[PDB]
Design an enzyme around this catalytic site. Structure first.
Site, PDB file in Angstrom:
ATOM      1  N   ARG A  45       0.835  -1.158   0.043  1.00  0.00           N
ATOM      2  CA  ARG A  45       0.179   0.080  -0.066  1.00  0.00           C
ATOM      3  C   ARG A  45       0.851   1.379  -0.043  1.00  0.00           C
ATOM      4  NH1 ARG A  45      -4.521   3.525   3.073  1.00  0.00           N
ATOM      5  NH2 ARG A  45      -5.861   3.424   1.627  1.00  0.00           N
ATOM      6  N   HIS A  49       0.585   4.052  -2.901  1.00  0.00           N
ATOM      7  CA  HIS A  49       0.111   5.504  -2.281  1.00  0.00           C
ATOM      8  C   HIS A  49       1.349   6.489  -2.665  1.00  0.00           C
ATOM      9  CE1 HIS A  49      -3.725   5.323   0.242  1.00  0.00           C
ATOM     10  NE2 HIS A  49      -3.725   4.708  -0.966  1.00  0.00           N
ATOM     11  N   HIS A 172      -6.073  -6.105  -2.996  1.00  0.00           N
ATOM     12  CA  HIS A 172      -7.210  -6.166  -1.916  1.00  0.00           C
ATOM     13  C   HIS A 172      -7.250  -7.447  -1.414  1.00  0.00           C
ATOM     14  CE1 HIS A 172      -8.903  -1.712  -2.220  1.00  0.00           C
ATOM     15  NE2 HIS A 172      -7.345  -1.664  -1.581  1.00  0.00           N
ATOM     16  N   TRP A 188     -10.442  -8.654   3.161  1.00  0.00           N
ATOM     17  CA  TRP A 188     -11.253  -8.999   2.069  1.00  0.00           C
ATOM     18  C   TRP A 188     -11.229 -10.510   1.897  1.00  0.00           C
ATOM     19  CZ3 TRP A 188      -7.973  -4.944   2.551  1.00  0.00           C
ATOM     20  CH2 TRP A 188      -8.285  -3.678   1.956  1.00  0.00           C
TER      21      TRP A 188
END
Ligand code: HEM
Length: 291
Positions: A45, A49, A172, A188
């Protein structure tokens, strides 16, 4: 505004393999993080980002300048929780002070995907730190409460098409939402520190109910204890995304190959690689090295 990749002086594949390895060994060692999920998912992540602020129209943001190290970007509300990934990487950077911040953040993502048994992700060095005033403003990362048309338009700014978007969202499978970071709560899927195509299988095969979480936000929940963001669920609401979700749910190798391409592209957006730059590196995992 052109960002030309410039190889860290005198460095070659073996230098970056050492950095990979240090990341990989720390991922193995610091296994208790986030109730034993480990740091793989937050590193993926962080790589995303730090790359996903890019705007194709003016080449602002992107992975090249490593600008997350400045308070405006590290304090972006959209980046809540990534401080954990940055803290992980701190001792890596101390041992290898010659690597640029953008190369380190992006390499952390590649290392995490591969160590979590994901596809090989070719990776190129040569991001160069840029100054504080090059940090992009907050608000370029996506909102989770939106629909497929939002998702599609958002990712146009990153030069990603439908297939690239659906492939990238398969990340995810990893980790979880944390209510205090994002206003969403839950994983998830079950295999949340091993890189698989489970995200797609769960989208199609679980029995999802639209519920409110304790932050008063809607999310899709299953009886197995899984969740999907509204933006995740949009991938099966839109018929074009749905077809691609079914493809990846039915073809693990295709998902791996398409993810690897899209993820490298995400991490390379905005960077001009000279003609005579080194070829992309494909790092060996610890396991491949017997380490
Ligand atoms: C419409 C696009 C997307 C939205 C709105 C979105 C949103 C979110 C949200 C809200 C979280 C939970 C953060 C938290 O509470 O800690 C999260 C986690 C995560 N996202 Fe995304 N995401 C998007 C795309 C992506 C992409 C493209 C990737 C990478 C290829 C990615 C990788 C991850 C990972 C690995 C986590 C788990 C982090 C952890 O466990 O600490 N996401 N995302």
């Amino acid at each position: 505004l052109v960002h030309v990749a410039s190889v860290e002086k005198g460095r070659s594949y073996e230098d970056f393999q050492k950095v990979y390895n240090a990341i990989a060994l720390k991922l193995r060692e610091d296994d208790e993080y986030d109730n034993y999920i480990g740091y793989g998912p937050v590193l993926v992540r962080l790589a995303w980002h730090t790359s996903g602020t890019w705007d194709k129209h003016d080449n602002t943001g992107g992975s090249y300048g490593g600008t997350y190290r400045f308070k405006k970007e590290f304090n972006d509300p959209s980046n809540a929780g990534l401080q954990n990934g940055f803290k992980f990487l701190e001792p890596i950077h101390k041992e290898f002070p010659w690597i640029s911040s953008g190369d380190l953040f992006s390499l952390g993502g590649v290392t995490a995907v591969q160590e979590m048994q994901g596809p090989k992700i070719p990776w190129r060095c040569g991001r160069v730190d840029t100054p504080e005033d090059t940090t992009p403003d907050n608000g370029r990362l996506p909102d989770a409460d939106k629909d497929a048309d939002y998702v599609r338009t958002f990712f146009q700014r990153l030069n990603m098409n439908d297939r690239e978007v659906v492939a990238l969202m398969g990340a995810h499978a990893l980790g979880k939402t944390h209510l205090k970071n994002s206003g969403y709560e839950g994983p998830w899927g079950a295999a949340n520190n091993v890189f698989t195509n489970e995200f797609y299988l769960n989208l199609l095969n679980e029995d999802w109910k639209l519920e409110k979480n304790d932050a008063n936000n809607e999310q899709w929940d299953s009886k197995s204890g899984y969740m999907m963001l509204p933006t995740d669920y949009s991938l099966i609401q839109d018929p074009k995304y749905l077809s691609i979700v079914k493809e990846y749910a039915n073809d693990q190798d295709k998902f791996f190959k398409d993810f690897s391409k899209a993820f490298e592209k995400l991490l390379e957006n905005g960077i001009t690689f000279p003609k005579d730059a080194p070829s992309p590196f494909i790092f060996k995992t610890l396991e491949e090295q017997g380490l």
